[PDB]
Design a protein around this nucleic acid. Structure first.
Lengths: 99, 45, 131, 217, 115, 64
RNA sequence: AGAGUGUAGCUUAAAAGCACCCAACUUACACUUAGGAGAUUCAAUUGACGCUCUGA
């Protein structure tokens, strides 16, 4: 029974008449656009860092795999046999303060 | 690299103010939650 | 025409595709469509990380079928020490991941555990649910 | 081709505290906060505050303040934990509570006879014993603790070779969930290291490639 | 009086013109060709023309101004510009159309006078 | 009866099974440009075309 | 120490075209629109600075 929460509340539709004003200035908009440019460049650099890291660690994994192939095949069998420990994969993100 | 998912804007058009309240579970840690009636400390028993 | 050497030159249905278990064979390994549940008390951060994992899977060539969600589970819990109310709005972004190998799945799990956001819980499991 | 059998395990510990931000990202956060200010509608607290202020103005012509005050009082009386547990001590490189914003790598010093080598903890896998089980019993033996930790899969991560008869070094990935450590002041010089601490401490190009495939973030 | 190629009804674009204005909005460059029906390009305006490369919406407009001068140069006064609906609605293309119209070129074309 | 083609038939380099892994145009203009290139190609069959139809200066440019 | 060597990520390009990321339409992806970032590694067809592989 899928009950999504995308519906706009009729209470808000009635009492949505309190702050209808939006005012911006020339210098504020210029700083908005320039900071958008710098942030776009920064996220591009961070994405390129992510790409370099993933290709580096994929390269390390594939060279590990090919060295394992040239030394032994049954280790490849048991290694490509994936573990059932991944089935209840339940982990939690970082916090703000230690306990 | 958690700041990408921790930094976002609300894409919808009709919503209330977002208050950075600090939820404290009994584990002894704080977390930034969006809750109305902005109590700064929000403790769980 | 059919007897002419330009037969079949206008074929397109052979180019267009238009018409679950988990296999462990021994040399090709492929999990079924597995659910990630992004449990968060912050809807904006949950949506942002759902979009992050969506574009990560699309860029790393994983077909993403569904990106649905299950909403708020308030629990009416008292602030026992006076009486104080506390409503709870948790939301879980449930996204399907289809294509996984051993090493590539390890890569993807390493990436998401490195990119775990603030106060957001991941839940990787199977599709045996009733939404 | 006599292949000497030698394995290892590259152990990780996931971060706890959030990464401190840069001024540019804090400025972007302020910009998004301004977006939220100018886009939000019908904030319950501020709207009822303005309503009660105008109503008391009318009543004196013809609560939000104390609630904000007690919010401030509980903010001040709530003690916060130590966010940085690194620069307050600056010396204990051994403890598990060393650093919390980035992950840590287990690393150890012990001395052999022929070589005096700084080693990410090795293992001696048997031909019949799998490398997963070798890693489990190796973590059980040389760390003498109770680590309950997740192993991602049987798929390996890093293999390197040295020829003298030759041997190899084999590296997995594993992150800790709960750690019970006993007799931290032990003999085997084990340090939990950062990426730059790795790049400082590591002697060989083998551990340089280890520093390559360890996540930098 | 000359025949326009008045077929091709199920296929985009129409080949009913004497002179088509075609715009190529590629990466780092905006190209603007003015070609006869028979494929043969008549007048070109590139931003990779290594002269206008000095001094993007404004780049598109400048290509429009140089192209309008070159069309008056070559004695071409009427086009059939035909955009896909989205670059019809796009901002830089409206500026390009306006630039050519007050550069001296009409982006319609007279009907063929039969009889 | 049939007849083998007198050359390379179109759409033959990408008759691989992995169409879900091939790039698969999402737009219209990109197909349109590939179609224009195909319309310019030589094409063994029968066509409408058959019937009807220094470094210092670079451095100065970069500085400018 | 030896071999392969060299246009941003990629090219039977020669300073080109595809890729990249950003704001909006999107649950979201995509498309499209506004953008922006980008390379011929240096010294006169050659040598050396840089990567890979083979070594110690």
């Amino acid at each position: 029974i899928p009950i999504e929460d995308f519906i706009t509340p009729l209470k808000f539709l009635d009492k949505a008449r309190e702050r209808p004003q939006v005012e911006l200035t020339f210098e504020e908009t210029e700083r908005r656009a320039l900071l958008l440019k710098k942030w776009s460049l920064y996220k591009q650099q961070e994405r390129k860092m992510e790409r370099d890291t993933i290709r580096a660690m994929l390269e390390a994994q594939q060279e590990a795999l090919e060295e394992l192939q040239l030394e032994s095949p049954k280790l490849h069998a048991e290694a490509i046999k994936r573990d059932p420990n991944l089935f209840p994969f339940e982990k939690e993100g970082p916090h703000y303060t230690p306990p | 690299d958690s700041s990408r998912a921790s930094l976002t804007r609300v894409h919808r058009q009709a919503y209330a103010r977002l208050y950075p309240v600090l939820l404290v579970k009994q584990d002894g840690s704080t977390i930034h939650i969006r809750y109305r009636e902005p109590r700064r400390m929000l403790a769980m028993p | 025409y059919k007897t002419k050497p330009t037969h079949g030159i206008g074929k397109y249905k052979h180019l267009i595709k238009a018409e679950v278990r988990a296999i462990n064979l021994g040399t090709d390994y492929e999990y079924g469509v597995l659910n990630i549940h992004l449990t968060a008390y912050d809807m904006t951060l949950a949506e942002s990380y759902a979009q992050y994992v969506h574009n990560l899977c699309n860029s790393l060539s994983i077909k993403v079928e569904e990106s649905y969600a299950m909403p708020t589970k308030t629990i009416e819990v008292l602030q026992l020490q006076m009486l104080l109310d506390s409503v709870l709005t948790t939301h879980e972004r449930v996204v399907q991941i289809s294509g996984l190998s051993a090493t590539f799945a390890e890569i993807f799990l390493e990436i998401i555990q490195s990119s775990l956001p603030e106060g957001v819980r991941l839940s990787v499991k199977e599709h045996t649910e009733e939404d | 081709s006599p292949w000497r059998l030698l394995g290892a395990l590259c152990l990780q510990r996931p971060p706890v505290v959030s990464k401190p931000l840069t001024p540019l990202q804090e400025e972007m956060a302020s910009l998004l906060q301004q977006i939220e200010i100018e886009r939000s509608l019908y904030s319950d607290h501020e709207l009822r505050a303005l309503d009660e202020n105008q109503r008391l103005a009318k009543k004196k012509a013809d609560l939000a303040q104390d609630l904000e005050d007690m919010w401030e009082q509980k903010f001040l009386q709530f003690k916060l934990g130590a966010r940085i547990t690194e620069a307050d001590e600056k010396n204990d490189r051994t403890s598990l509570n060393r650093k919390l914003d980035r992950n840590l790598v287990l690393l150890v010093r012990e001395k052999f006879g022929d070589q005096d080598v700084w080693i990410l903890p090795q293992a001696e896998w048997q031909p019949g014993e799998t490398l997963r089980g070798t890693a489990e019993r190796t973590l059980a033996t040389l760390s003498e603790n109770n680590m309950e930790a997740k192993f991602l899969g049987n798929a390996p991560c890093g293999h390197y070779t040295f020829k003298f008869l030759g041997a190899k070094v084999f590296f997995f990935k594993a992150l800790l969930l709960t750690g019970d450590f006993s007799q931290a002041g032990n003999k085997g010089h084990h340090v939990w290291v950062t990426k730059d601490e790795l790049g400082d401490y590591l002697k060989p190009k083998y551990l340089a490639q280890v520093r390559r495939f360890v996540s930098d973030l | 009086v000359a025949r326009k190629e008045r077929g091709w009804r199920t296929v985009f674009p129409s080949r009913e013109f004497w002179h088509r204005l075609r715009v190529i909005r590629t990466q780092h460059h905006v190209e603007a060709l003015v070609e006869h029906q028979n494929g043969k390009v008549v007048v070109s305006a590139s931003t990779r023309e290594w002269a206008i490369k000095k001094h993007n919406v404004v780049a598109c407009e400048s290509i429009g101004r140089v192209l309008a001068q070159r069309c008056l140069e070559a004695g071409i006064n009427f086009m059939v510009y035909q955009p896909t609906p989205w670059e019809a609605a796009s901002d830089s293309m409206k500026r390009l159309q306006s630039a050519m119209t007050e550069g001296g070129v009409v982006l319609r074309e007279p009907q063929r006078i039969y009889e | 009866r049939r007849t083998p083609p007198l050359g390379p038939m179109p759409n033959s380099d990408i008759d691989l099974s992995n169409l879900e892994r091939l790039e698969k145009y999402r737009s219209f203009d990109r197909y349109r440009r590939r179609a224009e290139q195909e319309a310019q190609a030589p094409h063994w069959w029968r066509t409408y075309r058959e019937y009807f139809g220094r470094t210092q200066q670079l451095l100065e440019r970069k500085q400018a």
